[PDB]
Amino acid sequence: AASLVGELQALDAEYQNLANQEEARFNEERAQADAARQALAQNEQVYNELSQRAQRLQAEASQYQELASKYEDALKKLEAEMEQQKAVISDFEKIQALRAGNL
C-alpha cells in the first residue's frame, strides 16, 4: 500500500474540501433567499399602494393619462422583480427539502 496510502489521503483531502464547499454554497444560497423574502415582502407593499395610485389616475379623463401609463410600466417591472424573487425562494426551498431529506 505504498501509493494507495497516499492516494487515500489525497482523496480524503479532496473530500473534506468538497464537503466544506457544498456547505458554503448552501449557506450562500440561504442568505440570498432570506434577502429575497425581505425584499419581496417590501415590494408587495409598494406594488399594492402604487397600483392603487395608478388605478385612480387612469379612471380620469392628459397629465393623468401620462402618469397613469408611466405607473403601469414601473409596476410591470416591479412585478418581474417579484417573480424573480419568488423563484429564488422557491428554488432554495426545493433544495432544502433535499439536503435535509437525504438521511
Domain boundaries, the chain: 1-103
Q: How far apart are CA 83 and CA 91, in angstroms?
A: 12
| Contacts with 28 (C-beta within 8 Å, 6 or more apart), sequence order | none
* 44 close to 75: Cβ distance less than 8 angstroms: no
Helix (H) and strand (E) counts in the chain = 2, 0
The class (CATH top level) of 1-103 is: mainly alpha
This structure's resolution (Å) is: 2.5
Residue 13 cell numbers, joined = 483531502
What does the alpha-carbon distance between residue 20 and residue 59 come to, in Å, rounded to a whole number? 58
Rg of the chain in Å (alpha carbons):
24
Q: Method used for this model?
A: X-ray
Rounded Cα gap, residues 54 and 75, in angstroms: 9
**Residue 12 grid cell:** 480524503
Cβ(43)–Cβ(78) under 8 Å? yes
